[PDB]
Amino acid sequence: YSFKCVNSLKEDHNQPLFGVQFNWHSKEGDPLVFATVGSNRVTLYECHSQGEIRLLQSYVDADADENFYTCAWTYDSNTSHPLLAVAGSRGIIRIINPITMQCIKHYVGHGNAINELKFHPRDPNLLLSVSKDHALRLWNIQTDTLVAIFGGVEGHRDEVLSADYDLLGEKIMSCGMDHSLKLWRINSKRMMNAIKESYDYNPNKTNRPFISQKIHFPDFSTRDIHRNYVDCVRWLGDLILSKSCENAIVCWKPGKMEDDIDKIKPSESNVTILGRFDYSQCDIWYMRFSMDFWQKMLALGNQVGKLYVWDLEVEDPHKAKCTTLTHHKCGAAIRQTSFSRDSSILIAVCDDASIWRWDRLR
Amino acid sequence: DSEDEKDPEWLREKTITQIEEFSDVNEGEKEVMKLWNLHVMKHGFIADNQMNHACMLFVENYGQKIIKKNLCRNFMLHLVSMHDFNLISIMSIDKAVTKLR
Amino acid sequence: SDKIFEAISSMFPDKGTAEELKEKYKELTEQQLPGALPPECTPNIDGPNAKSVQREQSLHSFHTLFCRRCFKYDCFLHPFHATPNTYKRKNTETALDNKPCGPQCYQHLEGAKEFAAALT
Amino acid sequence: ENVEWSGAEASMFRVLIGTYYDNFCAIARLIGTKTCRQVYEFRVKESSIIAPA
């Protein structure tokens, strides 16, 4: 439980970055690779020993002005090539193949900026895209068809911000500016019929446009947790985690401690809070936390450049942990944290187009 | 294909749900109200001279169900109410239960 | 009760009212419930629990729910504040013919066949 | 005859009287529990104790 600054870098365009994503699809032993997106550029690096990090590749968009926002690593079932997709303010989604160093797929169906991208833990052709259009879409990146559109008569009213798959990949949570957090399901018969259909469609075959699925109702929701924005949520086994600009992270479960997660009636009107976590100076929004693939530690960026670290272990959240690893160079802000498949290294992005690196000493 | 018609899915859902909010009702009533209002939506009846044909077609579709629901007796109570609102003649109320079997 | 309700309403926008305060006061003072049918339980006809009741309560819900114009229950574009089916109608618009209603005919039995005109 | 007149069927008669006021042959035809004479009979039992129209 000790990371040390073994390297720190800085870009040249000096425009703030947002994204950090190790490729968690490393065949055991392969080098550590990770990427980061900035104003209108992407960056490819590789972790080396002795705090060495090596520039690998970088692309850029010129034909317009955009501030890229998110990324996600996946692969191709067909030939196992690594796959990275990104999206920015323009609201378009691109798909790049580093093996050929080209973009092979682009998607345009939103109406505003995008805010996050994630994949189904099991299926690799299912991309979830969260936007400001109040609508959370979901694509089959392989047959080039939309599937669902969550939002409508009972959706979010203002600029959905963040979402998160359950650990197994059948349940989602969503959070946006309207203090509102709503539950969606995927396991429903209708849903999976739809998905299977999606995996089968030839445009040349029919004169019909594929028929998506519109969903106008959350499985459950409330706004009683915070009295401010909510901009990042994390499934916890069957528990919940969320942050606000109120300088505290909270864990809770819906209903009562006795209430199972999978028996919850849609008209449920109660929630159970368990504990709180604390920190200092997160007085702005759009700042995220991450966790190890082994769900044992917690990382979080900070406004003034600090850090705050806990353990996801039996440490009682009343007095679970407190670990602040700090350096004296930048205190502008830190947007996002990221671990490898193991807990070896931890990266974070400062607000000034500067990178950091922290090598763990257990 | 003109991607537009009178019945939007989300509406059918919303109305049933809203009905279920009510506490002071028996299932032998809510089921009826829903089974009817949905068919109302399905065709868009406006003119009063239609209401006779309306209840006719209604059971003409939902015959098997109300039987399978064993709910015809409250159907008749509804027929009562509707005649009370001056849209049925007695010359058809019975006629419904007749065509029913 | 009153001042405590006001303080709770002030400290909480979720409650924000003494109406819910008196509702919980009544729920805690009595702590009992007649049933899903109203405090005057009106079980259904098509069900087992039957109870002969006058016509009014039998049609009460139906009257207190209908929206005549759109011909629907709970008009989504009509407020329900209105007058019930309590109105006037032609009391004599029938055939009014006496006949053998069958073996157990109401007519064909001079007791009832004459009490009908007597009850007229 | 003192016959099975279910509270369901009996409230049912209570409603059906507000509909014809003079026809046992139809009311009982709907209320399959009673008998048309028994309807006349129950009227002589109950509707004899009814309020004026």
CSV table of C-alpha atoms in Angstrom, one decimal, chain B residues 2-101:
chain,number,residue,atom,x,y,z
B,2,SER,CA,-45.6,6.6,-42.2
B,3,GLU,CA,-44.4,5.8,-38.7
B,4,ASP,CA,-47.5,7.4,-37.1
B,5,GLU,CA,-50.9,6.3,-35.9
B,6,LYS,CA,-53.3,7.0,-33.1
B,7,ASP,CA,-52.0,4.5,-30.5
B,8,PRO,CA,-48.6,5.2,-28.9
B,9,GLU,CA,-47.3,2.2,-26.9
B,10,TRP,CA,-46.1,4.3,-24.0
B,11,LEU,CA,-49.6,5.7,-23.6
B,12,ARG,CA,-51.2,2.3,-23.1
B,13,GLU,CA,-48.7,1.6,-20.4
B,14,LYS,CA,-49.0,4.9,-18.7
B,15,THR,CA,-52.8,4.8,-18.4
B,16,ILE,CA,-53.0,1.3,-16.8
B,17,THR,CA,-50.3,2.2,-14.3
B,18,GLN,CA,-52.1,5.4,-13.4
B,19,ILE,CA,-55.3,3.4,-12.9
B,20,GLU,CA,-53.4,1.1,-10.5
B,21,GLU,CA,-52.7,4.0,-8.2
B,22,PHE,CA,-56.3,4.0,-7.1
B,23,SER,CA,-56.9,2.3,-3.7
B,24,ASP,CA,-60.7,2.4,-3.4
B,25,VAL,CA,-61.4,-0.1,-6.2
B,26,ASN,CA,-61.9,-3.8,-6.6
B,27,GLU,CA,-59.9,-5.8,-9.2
B,28,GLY,CA,-63.3,-6.7,-10.6
B,29,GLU,CA,-63.5,-3.1,-11.6
B,30,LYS,CA,-60.0,-2.1,-12.5
B,31,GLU,CA,-59.6,-4.9,-15.0
B,32,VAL,CA,-62.8,-3.9,-16.6
B,33,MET,CA,-62.0,-0.3,-16.9
B,34,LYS,CA,-58.6,-1.1,-18.5
B,35,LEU,CA,-59.9,-3.7,-20.9
B,36,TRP,CA,-62.4,-1.1,-22.1
B,37,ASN,CA,-60.3,2.1,-22.2
B,38,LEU,CA,-57.7,0.4,-24.2
B,39,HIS,CA,-60.2,-0.7,-26.9
B,40,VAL,CA,-61.5,2.9,-26.8
B,41,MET,CA,-58.1,4.1,-27.7
B,42,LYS,CA,-57.7,1.4,-30.4
B,43,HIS,CA,-60.4,2.9,-32.6
B,44,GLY,CA,-61.0,6.5,-31.5
B,45,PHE,CA,-64.8,6.7,-31.0
B,46,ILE,CA,-66.3,10.2,-31.0
B,47,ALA,CA,-69.8,10.3,-32.3
B,48,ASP,CA,-72.6,9.2,-29.8
B,49,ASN,CA,-74.3,7.2,-32.6
B,50,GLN,CA,-71.2,5.0,-32.4
B,51,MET,CA,-71.6,3.8,-28.8
B,52,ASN,CA,-74.1,1.1,-29.6
B,53,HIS,CA,-71.8,-0.5,-32.1
B,54,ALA,CA,-69.0,0.2,-29.6
B,55,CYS,CA,-70.0,-2.1,-26.8
B,56,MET,CA,-71.0,-4.6,-29.5
B,57,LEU,CA,-67.5,-4.8,-31.0
B,58,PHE,CA,-66.0,-4.7,-27.5
B,59,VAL,CA,-67.4,-8.0,-26.4
B,60,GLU,CA,-67.0,-9.2,-30.0
B,61,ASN,CA,-63.3,-9.0,-29.3
B,62,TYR,CA,-63.1,-9.6,-25.5
B,63,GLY,CA,-65.6,-12.5,-25.4
B,64,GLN,CA,-63.2,-15.3,-24.5
B,65,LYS,CA,-61.3,-13.2,-22.0
B,66,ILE,CA,-64.1,-12.0,-19.7
B,67,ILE,CA,-65.4,-15.5,-19.7
B,68,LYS,CA,-61.9,-16.7,-19.0
B,69,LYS,CA,-62.0,-13.8,-16.5
B,70,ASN,CA,-65.4,-14.8,-15.3
B,71,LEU,CA,-66.0,-11.0,-15.1
B,72,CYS,CA,-69.2,-10.6,-17.1
B,73,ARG,CA,-71.3,-9.5,-14.1
B,74,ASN,CA,-69.3,-6.3,-13.6
B,75,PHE,CA,-69.4,-5.8,-17.4
B,76,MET,CA,-73.2,-5.6,-16.9
B,77,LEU,CA,-72.8,-3.1,-14.1
B,78,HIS,CA,-70.8,-1.0,-16.5
B,79,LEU,CA,-73.5,-1.3,-19.1
B,80,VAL,CA,-75.9,0.0,-16.4
B,81,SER,CA,-73.6,3.0,-15.8
B,82,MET,CA,-73.4,3.8,-19.5
B,83,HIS,CA,-77.1,3.6,-20.1
B,84,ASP,CA,-77.4,5.9,-17.0
B,85,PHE,CA,-75.2,8.3,-19.0
B,86,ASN,CA,-77.8,8.2,-21.8
B,87,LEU,CA,-75.8,6.4,-24.4
B,88,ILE,CA,-77.3,2.9,-24.3
B,89,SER,CA,-80.9,1.9,-24.8
B,90,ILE,CA,-82.3,-1.0,-22.9
B,91,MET,CA,-82.9,-2.5,-26.3
B,92,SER,CA,-79.2,-3.6,-26.4
B,93,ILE,CA,-78.0,-4.0,-22.8
B,94,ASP,CA,-79.4,-7.5,-22.6
B,95,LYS,CA,-78.5,-8.0,-26.3
B,96,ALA,CA,-74.9,-7.9,-25.1
B,97,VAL,CA,-75.2,-10.7,-22.6
B,98,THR,CA,-77.1,-12.6,-25.3
B,99,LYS,CA,-74.3,-12.3,-27.9
B,100,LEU,CA,-71.9,-13.2,-25.0
B,101,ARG,CA,-73.0,-16.8,-25.0
